[PDB]
Amino acid sequence: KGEDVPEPSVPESFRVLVKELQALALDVQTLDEKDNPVDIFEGLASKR
């Protein structure tokens, strides 16, 4: 479209890494400045 490319997002490889670490029963959680969890899965893996 003749525009500049947008700002990128989290890679899918990191999501795969997180899911594999969870499969190893390791609670990997991405946090923010205030230690609150940040959802990198766009709410697609949160049970409601």
Binding site: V16, K19, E20, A23
Partner: protein, 53 residues
């Protein structure tokens, strides 16, 4: 942790080293908030099938 701290005053160096290792593990578990029994699996997680297609 209290017993390990008390044993940490033993004159023997090997006893203090063993106490230090055990106490480091205990301190890690206490500060992290994890439970030791969580090291044994009761439910095994299953990877999403698209990562194991």
């Amino acid at each position: 942790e209290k017993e390990l701290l008390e044993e940490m005053k033993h004159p023997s160096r090997a006893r203090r080293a063993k106490a230090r290792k055990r106490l480091e593990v205990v301190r890690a578990f206490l500060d992290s908030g994890n439970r030791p029994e969580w090291m044994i699996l009761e439910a095994v997680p299953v990877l999403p099938p698209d990562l194991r297609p």
